[PDB]
């Protein structure tokens with residue numbers, strides 16, 4: 001592995017397609033190795049742009065737009081941060097010689113639920129919830145009847161729990177459909193009754209597949225609120241979780257860190273979905289590991305061996321997710337949100353108009369329970385105004 | 387403490403005066419809090435500028451130039467990375483209401499050996515090498531005569547060893563005096579301390595008081611640190627004494643921030659040497675060794691936030707990547723052999739080199755400090771620096 005010096009002729013150039021808080025840390029990790037960073041998003045002054053050598057604003061779902069920026073910047077790597085991007089162009093570009101992280105196919109399969117679910121369940125024969133896809137209200141109703149109650153309906157292209165409804169009875173059929181349309185095609189999944197859920201951060205690298213200690217999390221409105229590590233699990237469940245994760249990542253292909261979402265039922269594990277990149281719940285790794293999930297993703301995609309990952313003990317993250325409308329957000333009472341074994345991150349997002357993740361609180365303790373309280377408490381201390 | 391959002395009207399603005407690798411990490415820590423960063427240096431594309439919102443290239447020794455940039459950017463904090471700045475202008479600006487980290491007086495006292503040394507030895511009554519100031523070869527010649535051999539001669543406005551000479555013999559004096567003019571017309575003649583080892587006691591002064599990082603040991607060569615490690619093994623008595631010295635010094639200098647207190651240890655005795663009113667290069671080991679790096683600590687402190695505690699993650703070490711060549715397009719090969727479990731490397735982004743220059747650093751942890759040092763050294767040594 002050979003790296004150039006940023007801004008010099010032999011520079012190693014990385015293009016980030018999505019400049020949110022996750023891309024921001026990847027940018028900082030690239031910058032720490034003198035890697036040249038070009039940050040792309042759909043709005044100006046996006047978090048990763050604050051720490052990039054150059055920034056561009058385009059429609060990331062527009063293949064033509066994608067090709068233009070790639071031709072202009074000639075990056076060695078293209079690192080997407082989200083699912084909603086021009087995956088067919090990524091495939092083309094990859095064929096033309098661009099290194100798409102982890103690979104264009106991994107991005108194509110995961111941008112919509114159909115690609116990934118069918119691969120996991122049908123091709124890899126991994127355990128998953130029951131599911132049925134639907135492209136009409138009528139077919140939607142037929143799917144629910146077959147799957148049974150309760151079930152969850154979700155748009156095939158969505159994130160953060162958007163357009164999803166937990167369906168308990170036929171009464172909600174009409175509204176569930178509407179709501180889902182607001183997020184065409186949908187997935188209807190049977191409800192898995194897990195003991196708990198985890199994110200297994202799995203790194204595929206030149207030296208093999210590595211696993212971070214399991215990360216547990218709390219969802220609210222199908223969006224992450226708190227995360228912690230390590231999540232206690234049986235030896236058998238851990239092993240089965242690792243086998244599943246290893247299969248998924250290798251099937252998807254290429255080097256990078258993946259966030260494998262799993263449901264745990266005693267010693268049994270069920271596959272949910274996977275981010276072919278750093279995962280939001282993995283932000284806990286900003287305090288809990290020697291190498292954060294961001295540092296690990298960078299290490300792997302550059303072709304360097306991971307070697308190993310150190311976990312420092314019980315830790316947790318808690319989101320800073322206010323609700324307001326402002327283009328000039330401020331954060332007060334910060335003196336009461338940081339301290340011994342307690343930190344915060346403020347993303348630099350330029351504005352908000354409703355609910356948006358503006359930061360994260362991080363803590364360590366002698367138990368995950370204590371870490372979770374410490375982190376939640378700190379996040380709540382922050383006085384968001386605008 | 388109220389923080390705005392960078393690039394927004396209520397943004398909190400930090401101006402870095404010096405954009406090297408140390409400034410680069412402070413910038414990162416500011417950016418992690420959505421603090422707006424303006425990186426200033428005397429050359430373009432300095433490391434901290436890569437990660438800043440914007441930058442300016444000026445002669446930091448030119449007070450007017452300094453005022454102009456300051457006035458243009460209206461920063462809420464002015465954070466120096468080096469001694470070579472128009473400190474007089476810092477004083478004024480502070481007088482006009484600017485927040486200089488840790489305080490302007492602190493910078494002034496330490497940019498001139500005569501200030502800090504007199505403060506420490508005289509005012510503070512602390513243990514230091516013997517020394518003498520002089521304004522003429524006569525006085526110099528005279529002084530070296532008072533100190534004896536061997537002895538060190540340093541400009542009063544010198545760093546990285548620039549303009550220094552270790553004198554064991556009279557023949558040198560030709561040179562000595564002339565060298566003290568090469569770099570930096572006044573000097574200091576210090577006695578030689580025969581310590582068991584040197585340490586850097588990273589001391590943070592914040593709203594919740596003064597806290598210490600575990601002592602950092604190091605190896606210097608040709609005025610450049612080569613390897614540093616933590617924690618350096620010393621007696622509790624010695625550590626206790628070191629902290630005392632550090633506290634006394636930081637509080638006397640005043641202001642919030644992270645200070646690098648340089649000390650010598652002989653048995654249970656500790657001798658004050660000097661202090662950086664900012665993060666110290668040897669403290670780069672803290673990038674792997676603690677929950678809060680010296681850079682994170684500096685920012686936490688200057689922003690008026692509480693530190694609470696500092697966690698140390700066992701034996702750790704840093705080893706510099708310090709090649710010597712001339713190039714404006716450096717590349718680094720064999721990196722795959724410089725990273726792995728408990729091992730990381732940093733490459734600074736310096737635009738060019740023309741002689742000896744620090745281009746990166748290797749960081750390692752292990753079961754023993756010795757093992758940590760070797761792991762780090764070996765890693766730094768595997769990087770192939772091409773021109």
Ligand SMILES: Nc1ncnc2c1ncn2[C@@H]1O[C@H](COP(=O)(O)OP(=O)(O)OP(=O)(O)O)[C@@H](O)[C@H]1O
Pocket residue numbers: 129152158159160161162189190191192193197219222223261272273
């Ligand atoms: N079949 C299922 N059974 C039980 N709970 C489920 C099921 N599907 C999803 N959930 C719950 O809803 C949460 C969100 O689901 P999911 O991750 O599929 O949505 P998303 O929109 O893709 O969110 P993101 O991509 O941000 O993780 C899960 O983390 C889990 O708590």
Ligand SMILES: Nc1ncnc2c1ncn2[C@@H]1O[C@H](COP(=O)(O)OP(=O)(O)OP(=O)(O)O)[C@@H](O)[C@H]1O
Pocket residue numbers: 515538544545546547548576577578579580584606609648659660
């Ligand atoms: N009196 C002394 N006795 C023994 N060694 C000394 C003495 N003064 C300096 N040294 C050695 O030289 C190194 C550099 O000395 P000093 O720190 O005073 O120089 P400097 O130019 O101010 O460098 P910097 O500001 O970058 O540390 C010390 O770290 C120490 O190893």
Ligand SMILES: [Cl-]
Pocket residue numbers: 081082083084159
């Ligand atoms: Cl996404």
Ligand SMILES: [Cl-]
Pocket residue numbers: 131132133
């Ligand atoms: Cl189906």
Ligand SMILES: [Mg+2]
Pocket residue numbers: 158159160273
């Ligand atoms: Mg998802």
Ligand SMILES: [Mg+2]
Pocket residue numbers: 159160223224280
């Ligand atoms: Mg999410």
Ligand SMILES: [Mg+2]
Pocket residue numbers: 261273
């Ligand atoms: Mg999910």
Ligand SMILES: [Mg+2]
Pocket residue numbers: 544545546660
């Ligand atoms: Mg000095």
Ligand SMILES: [Mg+2]
Pocket residue numbers: 648660
């Ligand atoms: Mg020194």
Ligand code: NA
Pocket residue numbers: 049050051052053054436437438439440
């Ligand atoms: Na920039």
Ligand code: NA
Pocket residue numbers: 099100101102103104254255
């Ligand atoms: Na790839």
